[model samples]
Target: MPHRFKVYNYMSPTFCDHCGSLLWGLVKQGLKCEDCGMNVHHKCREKVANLC
Candidate 1:
């Protein structure tokens, strides 16, 4: 699965799907996959499973 991740700013509280960590930031908290909607941290993006 090809993940097209882009910088996403969540309106509500959100967590990283890969690392299970809190996304703490006012803007650009994490990256959201356009294909699968997977929310992950910038560093974790490369390690995310290709399950999408």
Candidate 2:
């Protein structure tokens, strides 16, 4: 199993590793892989799997 985390963005946009959509700023919430630090929207986590 992979480690999980909540990621927050406040500056400069970062894309979701799974869906390729941008994660916007100001407390924008998302899921992140604690093992590799890969970030994605919570919805996209299931799609990304362990690729990170």
Candidate 3:
């Protein structure tokens, strides 16, 4: 179980953890988002590679 933290994006924003082609939802859990259904956070998009 992932904790309530932020996970920056390290992959393309085109597919969902469910392997769905269309990933469009709300990711607010803040954890690993194991069941996010593809929703992304506003400040975590494509930021992992750049974050320290």
Candidate 4:
């Protein structure tokens, strides 16, 4: 089997540290850092490397 990870989404407003943009939970669009609680847009993760 391959590695597995869960996608975390916000229930409220949170900002993306990398892009400095607001992530609206109304659309459930964001991800969280498992170790530090860092949040970012789902798309940013693609453009950014070693995120987490």
For each candidate, what TM-score against the reference? Answer: 0.92, 0.66, 0.20, 0.62
Task: Look at candidate 2 and tell me the lDDT of residue 4.
Answer: 70
> lDDT (CA) for every model shown?
0.93, 0.71, 0.36, 0.64
Q: 7-26 in candidate 1: lDDT tens per residue?
A: 99999989999999999989
Over 4-44, each residue of candidate 2 has an lDDT whose tens digit, in order, gives 75655536677887788887656766766767878888777
Q: What lDDT is reached at residue 37 by model 1?
A: 92
Candidate that would win on lDDT: 1
- Model 1, which residues run further than 4 Å from truth? none
Clash totals in order: 0, 0, 0, 0
The global Cα lDDT (0 to 1) of model 1 is 0.93
TM-score of candidate 4 versus the correct structure, residues matched by position: 0.62
RMSD of 3: 11.1
Give the clash total for candidate 4.
0
Choose 1 or 4, whichever is better by TM-score. 1
The most accurate candidate by TM-score is 1
Q: Give model 2 RMSD, 1 decimal.
A: 2.2
RMSD of 1: 0.8
What tens digits encode model 4's per-residue C-alpha lDDT throughout 1-52? 2112236767776788669899875655777666666666778765544634
